[PDB]
């Protein structure tokens, strides 16, 4: 019953579209985005990547049982971490540059220590608490890890304890994506029900619900100001939502694209976002002018993941051909 | 770039590439099998006779050929989002229990049709199995079979009934020029079940190899 009142408030609080305000602003024209390097080490299709905190390193995890650490400037491979389960669908890089966590169909997402007196990567804490595959397990601190599963539950953990201190519930379907706010105080996630719920870490329960899609969602990211986020699903519809207004702002779609999305990201100032489609191409879109800024070729099969460093120098895209291209 | 640091860096990168290449070569001389079916269709007995916390793994050895069987029934999730990991598998082993026609087998039919005509599994040949033929015999000589499906009228002979089950299972695949299906009857105690899989895999390899030469 309250849903009708909430919808009435939603339609009352919205009066203008961002197109009206941007109509007085000229677009930034065409930018030439050219590849600089190409990374060639993977045999099977790759599934994830995570940019470092110093804009120089990244990791990628593939189905051949290996996840690998590169140096982005000289394209030198530095670490090869053999796995236990050949099914790996997610990866993460610790903000302090110490840990990497990955996990797939077996109901776990392990923990690896990079900087070791041993001198080699080992597994530290095997986090086993779900009844489904894990789609994304990111990092909050050097000691708190947040996991999102196909078990229709997002689980906040604590590595040293070994047991989850808090559990999150509220999705009928299974969640496949999870993103963190810059202040490490809130985080959001979305599931196959085409809904995204703002999760709080202090008290451990959701606050608000974000809807508008009609299919399963693939990736999300916050706006860098710590107030908004943009989402991607298989309906070729990137949607934009903000924490404060709790509304729909801009629909990012086009009539000549019919395939889905796989990952999204924002530029340093949020002027433009990325989207690596199923037609093995990326697409830079003006985040305000809502027009296609350019198209990037370079792969053959399908984009799997992409991201931008902290400083904005680089952007790296991955695909099922097992090739990573560094762009500039 | 003419410093020991970056020379050592490129040396380490080259050796990491070489190690990865060797491993990728090693893990390709191996035949991967997706063992799929309903929960209580007799999978476990298949596991034991073939051998002689989510996805479960299995290993073999039989006359210089290596198999690999996965079990994807333990976990319940959105099947549409983890099936593409299984591309390049040689064959799919579908296990069905015969006794359960009157207890369900209709659901098995719906599952078979969904798994065979997958867009991602267009060109993979299917091995079939049929288990618990004994209790099928007792059930059919105690009770009729038309209650399962009245559209069929015929004798209560075990041969005719088993042939009808085989034909009903086999007529589901829509595409036949590239994909072919093998059936087999099992009585839960056989010494001739690994041989059937060996022969099916060998036939699959030969019929694929003749294709690129232009023959077949």
């Amino acid at each position, epitope marked *: 019953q309250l849903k009708n009142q909430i919808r009435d408030a939603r339609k009352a609080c919205a009066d203008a579209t961002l197109s009206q305000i941007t109509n007085n602003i000229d677009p930034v024209g065409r930018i030439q985005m050219r590849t600089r390097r190409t990374l060639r080490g993977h045999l099977a299709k790759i599934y994830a990547m995570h940019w470092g905190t110093d804009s*120089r*390193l990244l990791v990628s995890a593939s189905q051949d049982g290996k996840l690998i650490i590169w*140096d982005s*400037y000289t394209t*030198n491979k*530095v670490h090869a971490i053999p796995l236990r389960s050949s099914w790996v669908m997610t990866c993460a890089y610790a903000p302090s*540059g110490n840990y990497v966590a990955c996990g797939g169909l077996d109901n776990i997402c392990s923990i690896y220590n990079l*900087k070791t*007196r*041993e*001198g*080699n990567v080992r597994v530290s804490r095997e986090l086993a608490g779900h009844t489904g595959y894990l789609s994304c397990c990111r990092f909050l601190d050097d000691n708190q890890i947040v996991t999102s599963s196909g078990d229709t539950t997002c689980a906040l953990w604590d590595i040293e304890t070994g047991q989850q201190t808090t559990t999150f519930t509220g999705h009928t379907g299974d969640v496949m994506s999870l993103s963190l706010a810059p202040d490490t105080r809130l985080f959001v996630s979305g599931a196959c029900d085409a809904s995204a719920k703002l999760w709080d870490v202090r008290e451990g329960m959701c606050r608000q619900t974000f809807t508008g899609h009609e299919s399963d969602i693939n990736a999300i990211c916050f706006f860098p100001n710590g107030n908004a986020f943009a989402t991607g699903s298989d309906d070729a519809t990137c949607r934009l939502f903000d924490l404060r207004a709790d509304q729909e702002l801009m629909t990012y779609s086009h009539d000549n694209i019919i395939c889905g999305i796989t990952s999204v990201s924002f530029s340093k100032s949020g002027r433009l976002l990325l989207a690596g489609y199923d037609d093995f191409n990326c697409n830079v879109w003006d985040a305000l002018k809502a027009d296609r800024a350019g198209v990037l070729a370079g792969h053959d099969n399908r984009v799997s993941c992409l991201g931008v460093t902290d400083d904005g120098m680089a952007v790296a895209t991955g695909s099922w051909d097992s090739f990573l291209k560094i762009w500039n | *770039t003419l*410093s*020991a*640091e*970056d*020379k*050592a*860096a490129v*040396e*380490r990168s*080259k*050796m990491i590439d070489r190690n990865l290449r060797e491993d990728g070569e090693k893990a390709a001389r191996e035949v991967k099998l997706l063992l799929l079916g309903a929960g209580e269709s007799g999978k476990n007995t298949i596991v034991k006779q073939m051998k002689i916390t989510g996805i479960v793994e299995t290993h073999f050895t039989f006359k210089d050929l290596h198999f690999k069987m996965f079990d994807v029934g333990a976990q319940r999730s959105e099947r549409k989002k983890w099936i593409h990991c299984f591309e390049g598998v040689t064959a799919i082993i579908f296990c069905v229990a015969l006794s359960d026609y009157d207890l369900r087998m209709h659901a098995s039919m719906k599952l078979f049709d969904s798994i065979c005509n997958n867009k991602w599994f267009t060109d993979t040949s299917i091995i079939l199995f049929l288990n618990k033929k004994d209790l099928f015999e007792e059930k059919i000589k105690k009770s009729p079979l038309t209650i399962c499906y009245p559209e069929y009228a015929g004798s209560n002979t075990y041969e005719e009934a088993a042939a009808y089950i085989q034909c009903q299972f086999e007529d589901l695949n829509k595409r036949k020029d590239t994909k072919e299906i093998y059936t087999h009857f099992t009585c839960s105690t056989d010494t001739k079940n690994v041989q059937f899989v060996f022969d099916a895999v060998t036939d699959v390899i030969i019929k694929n190899n003749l294709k690129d030469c232009g023959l077949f």
Partner: single-chain antibody
Amino acid sequence: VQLVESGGGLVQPGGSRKLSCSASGFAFSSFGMHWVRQAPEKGLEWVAYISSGSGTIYYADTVKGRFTISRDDPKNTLFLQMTSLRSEDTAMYYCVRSIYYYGSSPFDFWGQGTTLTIVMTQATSSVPVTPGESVSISCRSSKSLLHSNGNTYLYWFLQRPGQSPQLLIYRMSNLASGVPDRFSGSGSGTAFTLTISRLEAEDVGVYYCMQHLEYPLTFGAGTKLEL
């Protein structure tokens, strides 16, 4: 983790001796290997280097060919083939480990050492210290050490009297792990100094300033600090 070495002793001139450094608690197959010798009264002097799997092996001018090197991944046993020794070859041969990539910490963990019997110069040989004060040591290089990648191939090493040395500051601007988190350094091309802030007990030792820009791996003349 522990590194232990053997093969020391006394050999008559013109003889041959085999030198080894056993490995335990780590993967030798994923680490480089280096050898640095120090005279009983002088500073360090680098010997050779082995990449992973002996892909590359260099030597200094004075040790090119007459001291060959090898490694053993499966058995984790190190080999040093030596022949025709002279009086100037006696020194403390230090089993030094390292790794090379971004974020590296070369020369981080050192063995005990073996007893077998670009020009870089340091400003002052010996400087007295007093507790609670601040003292700095400067280091000068003949040529600018800044390379095209911006990485200053400068290291400072400290050896406690009678013990194996440690890594303190690498790249002249980054602080090693396990240090008391007090030392710091700064400077510009060929102009560098080591600043000790709030010096404390057990800081008595010798500081070493070595280059890595080119590849002769030459060290400084030594810097002594005494209470």
